[PDB]
Scaffold this motif. Structure first.
Motif, PDB file in Angstrom:
ATOM      1  N   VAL A  28     -53.791  85.502  76.014  1.00 26.94           N
ATOM      2  CA  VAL A  28     -54.830  84.665  76.595  1.00 26.94           C
ATOM      3  C   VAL A  28     -54.188  83.611  77.490  1.00 26.94           C
ATOM      4  O   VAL A  28     -54.607  83.395  78.620  1.00 26.94           O
ATOM      5  N   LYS A  29     -53.147  82.942  76.995  1.00 25.19           N
ATOM      6  CA  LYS A  29     -52.476  81.966  77.845  1.00 25.19           C
ATOM      7  C   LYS A  29     -51.896  82.631  79.091  1.00 25.19           C
ATOM      8  O   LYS A  29     -52.020  82.119  80.209  1.00 25.19           O
ATOM      9  N   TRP A  30     -51.254  83.782  78.899  1.00 22.24           N
ATOM     10  CA  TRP A  30     -50.590  84.467  80.012  1.00 22.24           C
ATOM     11  C   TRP A  30     -51.602  84.906  81.062  1.00 22.24           C
ATOM     12  O   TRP A  30     -51.389  84.744  82.266  1.00 22.24           O
ATOM     13  N   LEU A  31     -52.720  85.467  80.613  1.00 18.02           N
ATOM     14  CA  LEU A  31     -53.744  85.975  81.512  1.00 18.02           C
ATOM     15  C   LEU A  31     -54.354  84.851  82.351  1.00 18.02           C
ATOM     16  O   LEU A  31     -54.725  85.058  83.501  1.00 18.02           O
ATOM     17  N   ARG A  32     -54.452  83.684  81.732  1.00 16.68           N
ATOM     18  CA  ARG A  32     -54.966  82.485  82.387  1.00 16.68           C
ATOM     19  C   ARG A  32     -54.195  82.259  83.685  1.00 16.68           C
ATOM     20  O   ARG A  32     -54.769  81.907  84.721  1.00 16.68           O
ATOM     21  N   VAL A  33     -52.884  82.491  83.605  1.00 15.21           N
ATOM     22  CA  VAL A  33     -51.986  82.333  84.741  1.00 15.21           C
ATOM     23  C   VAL A  33     -51.843  83.585  85.593  1.00 15.21           C
ATOM     24  O   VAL A  33     -51.812  83.496  86.825  1.00 15.21           O
ATOM     25  N   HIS A  34     -51.750  84.772  85.009  1.00  9.78           N
ATOM     26  CA  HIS A  34     -51.391  85.974  85.740  1.00  9.78           C
ATOM     27  C   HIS A  34     -52.455  87.052  85.846  1.00  9.78           C
ATOM     28  O   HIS A  34     -52.191  88.041  86.536  1.00  9.78           O
ATOM     29  N   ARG A  36     -55.407  87.095  86.970  1.00 11.99           N
ATOM     30  CA  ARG A  36     -56.110  86.996  88.234  1.00 11.99           C
ATOM     31  C   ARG A  36     -56.353  88.362  88.863  1.00 11.99           C
ATOM     32  O   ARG A  36     -57.460  88.674  89.290  1.00 11.99           O
ATOM     33  N   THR A  37     -55.300  89.165  88.895  1.00 16.94           N
ATOM     34  CA  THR A  37     -55.257  90.445  89.585  1.00 16.94           C
ATOM     35  C   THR A  37     -55.473  91.645  88.679  1.00 16.94           C
ATOM     36  O   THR A  37     -55.179  92.791  89.041  1.00 16.94           O
ATOM     37  N   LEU A  38     -55.991  91.438  87.467  1.00 19.43           N
ATOM     38  CA  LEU A  38     -56.081  92.593  86.568  1.00 19.43           C
ATOM     39  C   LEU A  38     -57.500  93.097  86.397  1.00 19.43           C
ATOM     40  O   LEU A  38     -58.474  92.342  86.377  1.00 19.43           O
ATOM     41  N   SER A  39     -57.686  94.412  86.246  1.00 15.20           N
ATOM     42  CA  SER A  39     -59.037  94.862  85.898  1.00 15.20           C
ATOM     43  C   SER A  39     -59.339  94.550  84.434  1.00 15.20           C
ATOM     44  O   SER A  39     -58.488  94.021  83.715  1.00 15.20           O
ATOM     45  N   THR A  40     -60.549  94.897  84.012  1.00 12.16           N
ATOM     46  CA  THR A  40     -60.947  94.742  82.616  1.00 12.16           C
ATOM     47  C   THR A  40     -60.200  95.739  81.737  1.00 12.16           C
ATOM     48  O   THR A  40     -59.766  95.387  80.639  1.00 12.16           O
ATOM     49  N   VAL A  41     -60.042  96.970  82.233  1.00 13.16           N
ATOM     50  CA  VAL A  41     -59.359  97.988  81.438  1.00 13.16           C
ATOM     51  C   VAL A  41     -57.876  97.659  81.299  1.00 13.16           C
ATOM     52  O   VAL A  41     -57.263  98.027  80.303  1.00 13.16           O
ATOM     53  N   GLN A  42     -57.325  96.974  82.299  1.00 14.40           N
ATOM     54  CA  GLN A  42     -55.917  96.582  82.210  1.00 14.40           C
ATOM     55  C   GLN A  42     -55.765  95.460  81.192  1.00 14.40           C
ATOM     56  O   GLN A  42     -54.834  95.462  80.392  1.00 14.40           O
ATOM     57  N   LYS A  43     -56.695  94.510  81.209  1.00 12.62           N
ATOM     58  CA  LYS A  43     -56.695  93.481  80.183  1.00 12.62           C
ATOM     59  C   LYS A  43     -56.822  94.110  78.797  1.00 12.62           C
ATOM     60  O   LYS A  43     -56.153  93.660  77.866  1.00 12.62           O
ATOM     61  N   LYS A  44     -57.680  95.121  78.658  1.00  9.59           N
ATOM     62  CA  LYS A  44     -57.841  95.720  77.328  1.00  9.59           C
ATOM     63  C   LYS A  44     -56.562  96.445  76.917  1.00  9.59           C
ATOM     64  O   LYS A  44     -56.207  96.438  75.739  1.00  9.59           O
ATOM     65  N   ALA A  45     -55.906  97.054  77.906  1.00 11.85           N
ATOM     66  CA  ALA A  45     -54.661  97.763  77.628  1.00 11.85           C
ATOM     67  C   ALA A  45     -53.590  96.789  77.146  1.00 11.85           C
ATOM     68  O   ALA A  45     -52.741  97.167  76.343  1.00 11.85           O
ATOM     69  N   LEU A  46     -53.639  95.551  77.633  1.00 12.16           N
ATOM     70  CA  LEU A  46     -52.666  94.561  77.160  1.00 12.16           C
ATOM     71  C   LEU A  46     -53.042  94.092  75.763  1.00 12.16           C
ATOM     72  O   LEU A  46     -52.165  93.787  74.953  1.00 12.16           O
ATOM     73  N   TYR A  47     -54.333  94.034  75.424  1.00  6.55           N
ATOM     74  CA  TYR A  47     -54.642  93.755  74.012  1.00  6.55           C
ATOM     75  C   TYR A  47     -54.090  94.869  73.138  1.00  6.55           C
ATOM     76  O   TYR A  47     -53.579  94.652  72.040  1.00  6.55           O
ATOM     77  N   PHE A  48     -54.163  96.110  73.632  1.00  3.28           N
ATOM     78  CA  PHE A  48     -53.636  97.223  72.845  1.00  3.28           C
ATOM     79  C   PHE A  48     -52.117  97.111  72.724  1.00  3.28           C
ATOM     80  O   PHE A  48     -51.513  97.436  71.697  1.00  3.28           O
ATOM     81  N   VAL A  49     -51.495  96.646  73.802  1.00  2.00           N
ATOM     82  CA  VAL A  49     -50.041  96.456  73.777  1.00  2.00           C
ATOM     83  C   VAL A  49     -49.614  95.595  72.596  1.00  2.00           C
ATOM     84  O   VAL A  49     -48.647  95.940  71.918  1.00  2.00           O
ATOM     85  N   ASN A  50     -50.326  94.502  72.336  1.00  3.89           N
ATOM     86  CA  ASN A  50     -50.100  93.560  71.255  1.00  3.89           C
ATOM     87  C   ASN A  50     -50.152  94.227  69.880  1.00  3.89           C
ATOM     88  O   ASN A  50     -49.327  94.003  68.988  1.00  3.89           O
ATOM     89  N   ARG A  51     -51.176  95.064  69.705  1.00  4.30           N
ATOM     90  CA  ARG A  51     -51.304  95.764  68.424  1.00  4.30           C
ATOM     91  C   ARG A  51     -50.211  96.808  68.292  1.00  4.30           C
ATOM     92  O   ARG A  51     -49.549  96.944  67.263  1.00  4.30           O
ATOM     93  N   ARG A  52     -49.970  97.584  69.345  1.00  5.21           N
ATOM     94  CA  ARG A  52     -48.883  98.549  69.347  1.00  5.21           C
ATOM     95  C   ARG A  52     -47.511  97.936  69.090  1.00  5.21           C
ATOM     96  O   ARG A  52     -46.742  98.428  68.256  1.00  5.21           O
ATOM     97  N   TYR A  53     -47.202  96.871  69.831  1.00  4.59           N
ATOM     98  CA  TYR A  53     -45.935  96.164  69.612  1.00  4.59           C
ATOM     99  C   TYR A  53     -45.737  95.808  68.138  1.00  4.59           C
ATOM    100  O   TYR A  53     -44.642  95.961  67.583  1.00  4.59           O
TER     101      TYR A  53
END
Lengths: 130, 125
Positions: A28-34, A36-53
């Motif tokens: 959430v903090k990172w997205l606030r800054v970066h 800007r240029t992401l789709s919704t599906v890309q944002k969701k993919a990064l939430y998945f990244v967190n769970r996967r990691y």
């Protein structure tokens, strides 16, 4: 040789909830800054990244957690896992991984299975760990 | 946009270069990698081309227009083969490995892997 061990439920959930809350807050903090240029599906993919990691580092984290728990002396309480879980959730440099992904234009293709995991309570995200 | 014999030669050489590289890379550290992991890396190859296809077109038309008269398939095949020679994916392969984040091998990936490079989809900006 090791026989399977089953982590106490309350302990396990404490770890998960805390690791993923931290990861998610960081995103959430990172997205606030970066973001800007992401789709919704890309944002969701990064939430998945967190769970996967969390899934693929779990044995790395249990190594560390058990050493900490054992250097305790007494028997652990759920408070000890909430605490170790919150440290991991705020110590891990997830931002670098996100920056890499964005820069290489390789944020994962968002796929149906990723929605399966993102829709779960973080407490239920499954790990594969003997 | 570009032709089908064109795009085709373009996709089949690029993927071939990448694939050669991964083979080389697996040669060096494929030891502790499961099968789905390696297939994951082959997919990565194919999705990397797709996410940077546009970029490729910029460099591609460039060398395409800076030569003389209309080009032949022989030209494309060489272009993409160079492209397929230039991108060093070893860095990506190493990062994912180090980070323990070789992606989850999922049905869309096996699909995209199973096709012929000729048919691997792409998208002009």
């Amino acid at each position: 040789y090791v026989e399977p061990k089953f982590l106490n439920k309350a302990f396990e959930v404490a770890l998960k909830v805390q690791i993923i809350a931290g990861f998610d807050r960081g995103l959430v903090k990172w997205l606030r800054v970066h973001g800007r240029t992401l789709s919704t599906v890309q944002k969701k993919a990064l939430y998945f990244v967190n769970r996967r990691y969390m899934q693929t580092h779990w044995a790395n984290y249990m190594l560390w957690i058990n050493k900490k728990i054992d250097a305790l002396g007494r028997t652990p309480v759920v408070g000890d896992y909430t605490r170790l879980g919150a440290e991991i959730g705020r110590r891990i440099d997830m931002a670098y991984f996100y920056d890499f992904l964005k820069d290489k234009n390789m944020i994962p293709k968002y796929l149906p299975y990723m929605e399966e995991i993102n829709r779960m309570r973080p407490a239920d995200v499954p790990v594969k760990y003997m």
